[PDB]
Design a binder for this molecule. Structure first.
Ligand SMILES: Cc1nc(N(C)C(=O)Cc2ccc(-c3ccccn3)cc2)sc1S(N)(=O)=O
Ligand SMILES: [Zn+2]
Lengths: 372, 326, 766
DNA sequence: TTTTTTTTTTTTTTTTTTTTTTTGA
């Protein structure tokens, strides 16, 4: 019952090929290429999951040797689209037979495309055509002014069907080069960030659901797990079609084990540590700003000085080096407490007492010359 | 416009804060903040019909045995009082919803030669008249009222009202020493770099300003370049600075201004203003200066500047025309 | 990598506020009904118009210009439902560039397109009817009625066009069981305001206050006729206005039809309207809905930053600031002389000054001997137009040249129209098609970084670069990305054609001095070896209309050239890479400025972008039917067939040559409420980017700047805008010192930002 | 000597396809 969320992109127009796949028509159906996937199982405990419980469950899920660990697989294929959801499902397939799971492990651990037969014989018609049934109804109503209905609407007005399936799932297939462009040049980014920002962010919830692609790529950059060399020495920029990106991601070692299990937890950890320090610093910032009562020039000097003294490039570099990990296991993490807020408070926010009805600012430069 | 009762309560709070500040500044005095007389005067603008400002003057006896000496010392006393009255929550709670700018005290009326309008006097629009804020434990009310009419209570250098000891507070804090300013300046050096002072930069071009006429040493050779610039870009007055002598006039530690008065032709022949072409006599009513400063990546920047006596240009204001490298 | 950190973690509170601002349901009675917009159509004059509140929300994103305020917009787009818009086409394209550089953003249009602004609205009497506000305190209803009376000649037309269009749309789907979420997808070409309630207006300070209400008003319109699911959910618009409040201003132009005196007064922009109006600052609750971005990223100086701080925040001007800006002053005759500061953009505070400066440099370059070439620009007035309009102006006596005394600015894009050196108008009656036509000459410079002003249709004829630059294009397929993902086959056909046409270039490089006999011998030997696994020979080009064809036939040609480039790259080292490779689909000979692209076939038809920095090349004629989409307009179409219309050729940043179309613009303004097509102006619409006005400089940032300041007219806001267009203070020269001269400073919005920086509920992002 | 009068933005609907060269007085 292991559930997989999969992002795919065929050779050409993925929308037309996918619709033809749904209609069981042998006219246009390029073999399916799966290049990012998130596997999960429904948690049987009410509030049992902990961070290490989740890490153990995930490390069990992503088989270190390759592939997954379940017997039956419900895979929900998706495209880059919006309903704000970053992806959109297209079709759902069951994999219970030995041949079905053999094809899924092969296509999930190596990257060999899934032929139309394997999918077409395994559409969950009880739910697949149910996902887009409302789109069928809306198309019927619009053109007036399940699978037989889909075929009939395919025949009647092709232009409007294609336009509707391209407006929804708006991104669809952009380009092979686009993915290598917008999801980092590194293999770590290309696998892990594509998994998280698309198929893992909104499902797992948390703060990372509201973070942008550049932020998530930065978090991945500081997720500096050990890097083993690539057995084929294939460079990340030597990729032209999706048969290369898929092969790079599936036979990567940031995809089927500890790193694939630690990244979602590390996103949450980094954000928590960062917000702990930033929110403290902004509490101080807002309070001192509100009660400063100084001249306009000196006010600007304080606001810029304080934002520098807390968020300067050196302080920021030390902080990001304090949250960088060297291992995905949360109980074996090498991240250590960040010095940002304590250092900022120690030097600049220690003089708040001077402006607290003390007159300590005078005491700093008093020189009381009273000659007797 | 404000109600008088709110103003009087705010003035009581001001008395409290100022007396705390005074007992802090003069530590060996005895200022009981319920009997020490502060005197208040308001400018005529009941309903305070104030559309511009509530003109106030606050007079405090300097507590015995102290006497304050120096313009800067009273400047510091004023800063302490000003930053002490905006600490008492009562004052800010009372008058805060009314004051657009929280700055109340002006500290520039204490320089030598600067005048302050006395109470019981008007302006040529408002005769400063007393507003009585009786001390909370004043043991002589009639004396306090008939203390605002004695000129000694509102005169800077009045006779102090059998002195054994006397303590003269003649120096307090300095200027531009704010912690924000001193921290920001230090961070600038760490992050951006050191901008060498004018003297150090001039020292590279064999100029030691300790001796007299040394800056004129470089101003000499600089005059040729400046004249070459003007007789190319500003030619309609070309033959005017052929023979001039740099006269050192203003010396700030980052701004050396040398006047360029001539002798040739006529001793008092004024230098025609380079811009805003005027008549024969109006144009020849201007002065010229050379300004050495430090600029860019620590390179001595030389500027030609003018001071015109005509209405078209800002009268008696210094203007710049070109800045050349050296 | 640490640069983004502050924005990354400070935009989240912004995101966690816009969400509740957009998910706040209104009471049933407060929702503007359809009958409201029905009555608005019935109303003739904007006087009996009933006082009607149109609910809305705002969230203000202020910050220095180029403070990277776009990171906030970027995060908003990928997380929230939103319709991103722009106050100017340039700003909209700038946001598109900065939103597609991270993820997918749908084509970003202007807010004017979003609320339905069309051609005839451009010259419309937008300031006619009066209003005595029953106010102080000004009710929001009165402010909205003022902004609707201001734009009566636009609001009324939009309402009438939307209403009288008829009802199906969402009304249909909503009754699926009596699915409107899937309605904008199935029913296409629907207005983008029907699918979101968060409207991001970037550089909103370029819009006047009249627009704010207008946008909200229009929002409700487009959600009432269509009965959008948001209208059923009782949601209200939230206007995320992003812009610089102290580096941007909005101006209103009114033309008096007897004095012929076009006047331009200053106006209250949306940002200033929201910040400084006590009614809007309370209803919109700007205190809990304001984000100030405070960092100037591009800037890498220290004293330059302090000066920007004092100018933007209204801080007192001290002696030290005067001495700092003293190091920039260079004489009046030094800036204006074209021999000085080559490549530095020069700003003036008058359009006449720019018209003078552009002409002198033209003479300089011409006498000294780029090429100062002459190119025709025409105009087309009609007899009936200037007959009836002269009749209606209460003065039937007015000469045509006196008609073109000032309406030349009001006949096309003002910016280049009043900032161009041109000849004498030859107004000759060409009434063959019942017309009177004019003829002048807008001398340009040859091979300069010019910018496209209006919307032009670029037709790429080939690439004039290096072998390495063309290898790069093919390797990353960057060109294909510029054409959009939906139509990639058209981009792949033309590259295929180029590679099968640019094979002769290799053979010319064969004639290069300093090469061994056997060096060239190995060159042709490896050419033969590659032909063995492939000499031009007789390759069969072309492909059917199939997706596979452009990924198989092109794939061979792409791999063919790629290999071939890299093959001779190793053979001749860096020499071959730097060798100039020009590929065209036709015999293109360019003697002097005149070019000749022979007979076009429209291999790749696209649209030029205004932001794209093009380079002037030459005026080939080569009449293309692609630009000749001419259908009044036909009466001048016949004359355009008669007189060969020159198509000016531009070179983009990559180096691809593109031939463009001309531009045509109408003048329609009148006083008798009779908007009729008077005159259409055919010209080129290109700008030099070498000299401009301070007011237009607000829009776009510049590399090197020399400012010419007119004394007396000194406004410190103009000084701040002029000095802030460049990143580095090193490359900045000025006429005089704006800090040392008398300057009219208007520090009213400055104190308002300062009080905003002094409020606990305002979010400051560093 | 008075003496001026400065600056801006928006205006769409698509991607291929019939060639002509003596005229005047
Ligand atoms: C010297 C030191 N280093 C710190 N940095 C890096 C800065 O200010 C950096 C900055 C901050 C604001 C701006 C800006 C730009 C346009 C308008 C207003 N402002 C520019 C640059 S802060 C200063 S300090 N401690 O003197 O205030
Ligand atoms: Zn003068």
């Amino acid at each position: 019952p292991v559930e997989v969320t999969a992002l795919y992109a065929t050779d050409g127009c993925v929308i037309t090929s996918s619709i033809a796949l749904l209609t069981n028509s042998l006219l246009g159906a390029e073999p399916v290429y799966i290049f990012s996937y998130d596997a999960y199982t429904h948690d049987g405990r009410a509030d049992g999951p902990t961070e290490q419980d989740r890490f153990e469950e995930s490390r069990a899920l992503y088989q270190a040797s390759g592939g997954l660990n379940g017997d039956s697989f419900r895979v929900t294929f998706c495209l880059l689209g919006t309903e704000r959801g970053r992806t959109r499902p297209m079709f759902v397939c069951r994999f219970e037979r030995a041949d079905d799971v053999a094809a899924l492990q092969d296509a999930l651990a190596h990257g060999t495309p899934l032929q139309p037969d394997h999918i077409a014989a395994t559409l969950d018609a009880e739910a697949t055509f149910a996902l887009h049934a409302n789109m069928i109804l809306a198309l019927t109503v619009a053109i007036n002014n399940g699978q037989r209905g889909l075929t009939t609407l395919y025949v009647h007005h092709e232009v409007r069907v294609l336009a509707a399936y391209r407006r929804a799932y708006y991104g669809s297939a952009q380009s092979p080069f686009w993915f290598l462009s917008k999801f980092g040049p590194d293999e770590k980014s290309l696998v892990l960030t594509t998994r998280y920002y698309l198929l893992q962010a909104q499902r797992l919830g948390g703060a990372g659901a509201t973070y942008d692609l550049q932020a998530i790529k930065d978090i991945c950059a500081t997720y500096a797990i050990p890097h083993a060399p690539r057995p084929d020495t294939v460079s990340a920029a030597s990729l032209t079609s999706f048969a290369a990106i898929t092969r790079f991601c599936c036979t990567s070692q940031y995809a089927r084990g500890a790193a694939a299990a630690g990244f979602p937890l590390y996103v949450e950890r980094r954000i928590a540590a960062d917000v702990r320090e930033t929110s403290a610093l902004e509490k101080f910032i807002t309070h001192d700003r509100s009660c400063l009562r100084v001249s306009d020039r000196e006010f600007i000097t304080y606001i810029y000085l304080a934002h520098f003294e807390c968020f300067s490039p050196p302080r920021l570099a030390t902080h990001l080096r304090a949250v960088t990990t060297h291992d995905p296991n949360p109980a074996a993490s090498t991240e250590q407490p960040s010095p940002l807020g304590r250092e900022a408070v120690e030097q600049f926010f220690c003089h708040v007492r001077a402006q607290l009805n003390i007159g300590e600012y005078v005491k700093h430069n008093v020189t009381p010359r009273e000659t007797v | 416009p404000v109600p008088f009762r709110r103003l009087h309560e705010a003035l009581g709070h001001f008395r409290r804060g100022a007396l705390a500040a005074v007992q802090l500044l003069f530590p060996a005095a005895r200022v009981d903040p319920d009997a020490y007389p502060c005197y208040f005067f308001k400018s005529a603008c009941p309903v305070c019909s104030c559309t511009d400002k509530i003109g106030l003057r606050v007079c405090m006896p300097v507590p015995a045995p102290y006497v304050v000496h120096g313009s800067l010392t009273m400047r510091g006393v004023a800063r302490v009082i000003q930053q002490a009255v905006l600490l008492d929550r009562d004052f800010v709670e009372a008058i805060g919803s009314y004051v657009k700018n929280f700055l109340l005290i002006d500290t520039g009326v204490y320089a030598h030669g600067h005048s302050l309008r006395l109470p019981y006097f008007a302006k040529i629009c408002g005769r400063l008249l007393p507003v009585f804020v009786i001390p909370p434990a004043c043991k002589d009310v009639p004396a306090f009222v008939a203390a605002h009419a004695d000129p000694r209570r509102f005169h800077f250098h009045a006779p102090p009202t059998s002195p054994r000891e006397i303590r003269v507070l003649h120096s307090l804090g300095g200027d531009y020493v704010s912690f924000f300013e001193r921290k920001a300046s230090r961070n600038a050096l760490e992050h951006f770099g050191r901008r060498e002072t004018l003297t150090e930069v001039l020292g590279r071009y064999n100029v030691q300003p300790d001796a007299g006429g040394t800056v004129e040493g470089f101003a000499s050779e600089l005059l040729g370049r400046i004249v070459a610039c003007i007789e190319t870009h500003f030619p309609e007055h070309a033959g005017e600075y052929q023979a001039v002598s740099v006269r050192r006039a203003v010396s700030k530690d980052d701004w050396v201004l040398l006047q360029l008065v001539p002798v040739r032709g006529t001793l008092q022949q004024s230098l025609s203003c380079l811009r805003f072409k005027h008549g024969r006599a109006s144009r020849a009513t201007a002065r010229t200066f050379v300004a050495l400063s430090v600029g860019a990546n620590n390179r001595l920047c030389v500027s030609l500047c003018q001071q015109c006596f005509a209405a078209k240009c800002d009268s008696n204001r210094l203007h710049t025309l070109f800045t050349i490298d050296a | 990598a640490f640069l983004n950190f502050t924005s990354m973690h400070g935009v989240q509170p912004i995101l966690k506020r816009i969400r509740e601002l957009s998910q706040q349901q209104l009471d049933g009675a407060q929702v503007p009904h359809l009958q409201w917009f029905r009555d608005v159509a019935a109303l003739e004059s904007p006087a009996g118009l009933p006082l009607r509140e149109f609910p809305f929300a705002v969230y203000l994103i202020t910050g220095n210009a180029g403070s990277g305020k776009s990171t906030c917009v970027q995060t908003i787009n990928e997380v929230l439902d939103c319709v991103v818009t722009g106050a100017t086409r340039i700003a909209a394209q700038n946001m598109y560039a900065k939103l597609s550089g991270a993820f997918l953003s749908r084509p970003i249009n202007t807010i004017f397109h979003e609320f339905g602004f069309r051609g005839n609205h451009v010259q419309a009497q937008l300031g006619q009817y009066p209003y005595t506000l029953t106010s102080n305190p000004a009710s929001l209803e009165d402010l909205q009625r003022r902004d609707l009376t201001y734009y009566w000649e636009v609001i009324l037309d939009l309402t009438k066009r939307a209403l009288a269009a008829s009802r199906n749309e969402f009304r249909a789907l909503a009754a699926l069981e009596r699915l409107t979420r899937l309605a904008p997808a199935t029913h296409g070409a629907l207005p983008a305001f029907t699918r979101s309630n968060v409207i991001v207006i970037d550089e909103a300070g370029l819009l006047g206050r009249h627009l704010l209400t207008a946008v909200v008003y229009c929002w409700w319109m487009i959600n009432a006729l269509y009965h959008t699911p948001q209208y059923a959910a009782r949601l209200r618009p939230v206007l995320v206005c992003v812009g610089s409040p102290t580096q941007t201003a909005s101006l209103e132009s009114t033309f008096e039809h007897q004095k012929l005196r076009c006047s331009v007064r200053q106006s209250e922009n949306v940002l200033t309207y929201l910040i400084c109006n006590r009614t809007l600052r309370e209803y919109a609750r700007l205190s809990y809905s304001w984000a100030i971005f405070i960092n100037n990223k591009r800037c890498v100086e220290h004293e330059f930053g302090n000066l920007m701080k004092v100018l933007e925040y209204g801080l007192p001007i001290t002696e030290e600031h005067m001495q700092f800006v003293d190091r920039f002053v260079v004489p009046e005759n030094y800036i204006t002389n074209p021999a000085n500061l080559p490549g530095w953009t020069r700003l003036f505070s008058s359009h006449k000054e720019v018209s003078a400066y552009m002409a002198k440099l033209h003479a300089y370059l011409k006498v000294t001997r780029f090429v100062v070439f002459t190119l025709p620009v025409l105009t087309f007035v009609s007899v009936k137009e200037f007959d009836e309009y002269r009749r209606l102006t209460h003065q039937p006596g007015l000469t045509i040249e006196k008609w073109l005394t000032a309406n030349a600015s009001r006949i096309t894009n003002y910016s280049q129209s009043q900032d161009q050196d041109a000849g004498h108008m030859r107004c000759e009656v060409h009434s063959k098609q019942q017309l009177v036509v004019a003829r002048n000459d807008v001398t340009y410079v040859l091979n300069s970084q010019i910018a496209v002003t209006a919307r032009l249709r670029k037709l790429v004829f080939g690439f004039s670069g290096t072998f390495r630059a063309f290898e790069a294009v093919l390797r990353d397929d960057s060109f294909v990305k510029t054409q959009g993902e939906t139509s990639v086959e058209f981009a792949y056909r033309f590259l295929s054609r180029l590679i099968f046409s640019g094979l002769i270039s290799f053979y010319n490089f064969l004639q290069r001095p300093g090469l061994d006999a056997t060096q060239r011998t190995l060159a042709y030997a490896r050419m033969g070896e590659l032909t063995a696994e492939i000499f031009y020979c007789h390759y069969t080009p072309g492909e059917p209309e199939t997706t596979a064809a452009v990924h198989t036939q092109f794939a061979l040609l792409k791999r063919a050239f790629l290999g071939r480039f890299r093959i001779l790259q190793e053979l001749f080292g860096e020499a071959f890479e730097v060798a100039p490779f020009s590929t065209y689909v036709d015999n293109v000979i360019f003697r002097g400025c005149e070019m000749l692209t022979g007979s076009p076939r429209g291999g790749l038809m696209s649209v030029a972008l205004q932001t794209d920095n093009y380079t002037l090349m030459g005026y080939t004629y080569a009449r293309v039917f692609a630009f000749a989409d001419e259908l009044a307009t036909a009466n001048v179409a016949e004359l355009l067939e008669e007189a060969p219309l020159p198509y000016v050729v531009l070179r983009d940043q990559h180096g691809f040559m593109s031939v463009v179309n001309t531009n045509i613009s109408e003048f329609v303004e009148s006083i008798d409420s009779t908007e009729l097509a008077m005159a259409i102006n055919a010209d080129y619409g290109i700008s030099s980017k070498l000299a401009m006005t301070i007011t237009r400089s607000q829009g776009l940032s510049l590399d090197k700047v020399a400012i010419c300041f007119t004394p007396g007219n000194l406004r410190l806001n103009s000084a701040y805008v002029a000095m802030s267009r460049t990143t580095s203070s090193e490359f900045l020269r000025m006429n005089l010192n704006p800090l040392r001269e008398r300057h009219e400073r208007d520090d009213v919005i400055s104190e308002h930002i300062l009080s905003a920086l002094r409020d606990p509920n305002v979010v400051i992002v560093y």
